[PDB]
């Protein structure tokens, strides 16, 4: 399962 | 043995027109189990292993939501990095991301990973302690500061040590027939005369899983690297892997040469004595 929320660079 | 779950993401800007080409693949060890492609018609995360089809509608709904959100992040990022590196709006650029977690032989969290590249080069990566970042250049220092201020590491660490591990365990159990099976290499040797006086001995390792393997030639019990060719391990297409190593020898002298095969599927290394 994928991580729920990635932050923008 | 340890096991890993990894997700690989590639986004490629197409400034001409439209959003980036985005492709996500998920692996457990050397087995792909899910994929998303922005150019595909479904616009859904799709199964690529029988054992993941056990998961119902809600699994797919959830992974699609998240993988689409991932695609938007990498789109924004392509814009931002273009700005940092002062690049033209004209050219195509690439962001790649890989993250995931390992469990040990005790089925407990072992290691976590999150690495990020721009244009094929390291950009930023989470360190082994899962608490700090490595920035490859001054542009990456900007991202590092932003992620530090926003406690990204903590959020990622919670995922990697928790959610990530838990699902890895689930996947390993559901797909045990294949994921937890080791396929020892099927080995053989071939012999090809290259003249009246010399011949090529090729030692083959076929249909093995997982991909990690060592193939080596010895001459009278000592490793031989001169006059050998070794191809890179390659996928057969059916989920297994292939490799070969070859040596040229004086004809009549083949008996001195032995091929040695090491693989997790072999209790004892193999020694082939022939040709």
């Amino acid at each position: 399962v994928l991580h729920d929320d990635l932050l923008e660079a | 043995g340890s096991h890993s779950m990894r997700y690989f993401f590639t986004s490629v800007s197409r400034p001409g027109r439209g959003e980036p080409r985005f492709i996500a693949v998920g692996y457990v060890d050397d087995t792909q189990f899910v994929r998303f492609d922005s150019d595909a018609a479904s616009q859904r995360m799709e199964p690529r292993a029988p054992w993941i089809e056990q998961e119902g509608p809600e699994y797919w709904d959830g992974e699609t939501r998240k993988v689409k959100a991932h695609s938007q992040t990498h789109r924004v990022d392509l814009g931002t990095l273009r700005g940092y590196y002062n690049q033209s709006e004209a050219g195509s650029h690439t962001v790649q991301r890989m993250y995931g977690c390992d469990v040990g032989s005790d089925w407990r969290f072992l290691r976590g990973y999150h690495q990020y590249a721009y244009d094929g080069k390291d950009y930023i990566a989470l360190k082994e302690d899962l608490r700090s970042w490595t920035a490859a250049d001054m542009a990456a220092q900007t991202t590092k500061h932003k992620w530090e201020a926003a406690h990204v590491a903590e959020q990622l660490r919670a995922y990697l040590e928790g959610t990530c591990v838990e699902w890895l365990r689930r996947y390993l159990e559901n797909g045990k027939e294949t994921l937890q099976r080791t396929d020892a290499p099927k080995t053989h040797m071939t012999h090809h005369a290259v003249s009246d006086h010399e011949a090529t001995l090729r030692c083959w390792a076929l249909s093995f899983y997982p991909a990690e393997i060592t193939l080596t030639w010895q001459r009278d019990g000592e490793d031989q690297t001169q006059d050998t060719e070794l191809v890179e391990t390659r996928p057969a297409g059916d989920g297994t892997f292939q490799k070969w190593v070859a040596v040229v020898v004086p004809s009549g002298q083949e008996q001195r040469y032995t091929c040695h095969v090491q693989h997790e599927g072999l209790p004892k290394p193999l020694t082939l004595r022939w040709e």
Binding site: - | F8, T10, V12, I23, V25, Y27, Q32, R35, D37, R48, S92, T94, Q96, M98, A117, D119, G120, K121, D122, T190, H192, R202, L206, V231, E232, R234, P235, A236, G237, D238, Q242, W244
Partner: protein, 100 residues
Amino acid sequence: MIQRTPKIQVYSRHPAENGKSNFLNCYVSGFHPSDIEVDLLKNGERIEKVEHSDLSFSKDWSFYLLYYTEFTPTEKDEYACRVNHVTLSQPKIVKWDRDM
């Protein structure tokens, strides 16, 4: 702007014998950027029923793909892979040798 040329291997999924059904593979790896054109050839003609794996990449960030199709080796037929990439001035063509 790093550019890496593709490494190419052409090979069959199973030990090959004339007249017996098999699969022809062209593994391309080590390349960057990801855009790449790969065709499998039968006597220089482009085979149509050709599929490929989902794009992924190695630890050094270089890309790899597997292109494959069903085929049947024969005495007289030549099979090959044709690859074009931004790093190549013209398409690279690698012949299938049953012993490699």
